[PDB]
Design a protein around this ligand. Structure first.
Ligand SMILES: CCOC(=O)c1c(-c2cccs2)csc1N
Ligand SMILES: [Cl-]
Ligand SMILES: [Mn+2]
Ligand SMILES: [Zn+2]
Ligand SMILES: [Zn+2]
Length: 455
């Protein structure tokens, strides 16, 4: 009556046969899981990667967090904890909060209590946590190559479900990206304590994500399917409009805690789960999610993109343009990079890339015709992929340019995409230059190579 828990999301227990190939399995459950936004995966009982670490030599800098509903927080980017000293702090905190041993505090109660304390202005509970990509002071919880390994660790070295491997796995089109986009393709490590929370969000470029809980107390999740993303945003806009004022950077995105019952009252479908140690949660493209930790724990998560995602990735960049939001990478650049490697591509990949490329080319044709009729006549080839990203964003909409852009000798170094030709400066169009990566005649043979590889 104070808190009504959302219905449970789907839970999968694949056989060893199904579990062998992660991407085939994900594709299998997709028609179910994409209806709920999140889903949980229980590995076969055998599958138990060796977690081993020294709690005294792993150090990290803690982030601090206030727990207030609808209050703005900034997406993550001093002091120092070891894994042991943080664990001691976290267990003492939970123990003193409930005056109970930690394992006897029911998960139902922590959930009820979380939503009570974030709503009450009178309570000012703050908590700490760890969040960073893997490094020398604190590294992956999965086995990696270096130090000699035991026969069990090397079994799990090349698993698909070893999350270090999906940044470079082939069915993930993110693997082929040449640009170092560390924040996005490398795994993040998360050290939780009781009530530490991740706000409502979707992934950059509407990618998938996958989260593994290595050990410790459970992680509670709320998820919304991708088809309801904009319903959720309209509810958020009405109840907390400050979160929507234009962000200066992509290191200035604002997010918040919000009760799922509030969303359910406004007809947004929400699902929940408790993720325990040894379990995976998977999020689908544009599926909103949030949650909190029940106690001291350690998780590891990574973004990825299947061939299924390619059309959504294009729609997402279009959506970023309307919103004037920064991109993490150029989607078109990624497509052309794969086309240029067509001979070594997986054939299903090749077929799906070909379809996206065909849309890209037809859209680019129409845009070039439009700017020609605006009086832009001069043109020159330009290798956009050699420019630092901050040197090739459209002045107006902030999109990362790759296929083409307009420049002018008047504003040296500035660019606009072909949608915003009128937003560069006050000179007449004949002083402008179309800068392009490829002619249409370069592009049709690149697409043809994909067609041949796909057969
Ligand atoms: C509070 C510890 O972090 C977590 O539990 C997280 C987070 C984040 C925490 C802080 C920023 S983003 C994302 S996904 C997950 N499991
Ligand atoms: Cl509060
Ligand atoms: Mn996420
Ligand atoms: Zn000018
Ligand atoms: Zn633009």
């Amino acid at each position: 009556s104070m808190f009504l828990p959302p219905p449970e999301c789907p839970v999968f227990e694949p056989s060893w046969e199904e579990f062998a190939d992660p991407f085939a399995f994900i594709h299998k459950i997709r028609p179910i899981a994409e209806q709920t936004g999140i889903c949980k995966v229980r590995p076969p009982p055998d599958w138990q990667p060796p977690f081993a670490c020294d709690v005294d030599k792993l150090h990290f800098t803690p982030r601090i967090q206030r727990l207030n509903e609808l209050e703005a927080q900034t997406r993550v980017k001093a002091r120092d904890y070891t894994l042991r000293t943080f664990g001691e702090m976290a267990d003492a905190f939970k123990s003193d909060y409930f005056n109970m041993p930690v394992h006897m505090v029911p998960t139902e109660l922590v959930e009820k209590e979380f939503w009570r304390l974030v709503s009450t202005i009178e309570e000012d509970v703050t908590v700490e946590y760890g969040a960073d990509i893997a490094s020398k002071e604190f590294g992956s919880g999965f086995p990696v190559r270096d130090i000699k390994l035991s026969p069990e660790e090397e079994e799990y070295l090349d698993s698909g479900w070893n999350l270090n491997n999906m940044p470079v796995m082939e069915q993930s089109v993110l693997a082929h990206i040449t640009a170092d986009i560390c924040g996005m393709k490398l795994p993040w490590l998360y050290v939780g304590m009781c009530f530490s929370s991740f706000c409502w969000h979707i992934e950059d470029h509407w990618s998938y994500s996958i989260n593994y809980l290595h050990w410790g107390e459970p992680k509670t999740w709320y998820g919304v399917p991708g088809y309801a993303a904009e319903q959720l945003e309209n509810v958020m806009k009405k109840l907390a409009p400050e979160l929507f004022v234009s962000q200066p950077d992509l290191l200035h995105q604002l997010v918040t805690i919000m009760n799922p019952n509030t969303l359910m009252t406004h007809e947004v479908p929400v699902y929940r789960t408790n993720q325990c140690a040894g379990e995976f949660v998977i999020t689908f493209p544009r599926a909103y999610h949030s949650g909190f930790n029940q106690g001291f724990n350690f998780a590891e998560a990574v973004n990825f993109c299947t061939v299924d995602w390619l059309p959504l990735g294009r729609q997402c960049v279009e959506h970023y343009r309307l919103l004037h939001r920064y991109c993490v990478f150029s989607h078109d650049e990624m497509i052309c990079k794969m086309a240029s490697k067509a001979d070594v591509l997986d054939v299903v990949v090749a077929s799906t890339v070909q379809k996206d490329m065909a849309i890209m080319i037809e859209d680019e044709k129409a845009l070039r015709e439009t700017v020609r009729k605006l009086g832009v006549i001069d043109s020159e080839r330009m290798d956009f992929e050699l420019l630092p990203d901050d040197e090739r964003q459209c002045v107006k909409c902030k999109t990362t340019c790759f296929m083409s852009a307009i420049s002018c000798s008047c504003k040296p170094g500035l660019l606009v995409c072909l949608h915003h030709v009128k937003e560069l400066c006050s000179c007449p169009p004949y002083k402008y230059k179309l800068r392009y990566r490829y002619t249409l005649d370069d592009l049709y043979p690149m697409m043809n190579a994909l067609k041949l590889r796909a057969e």
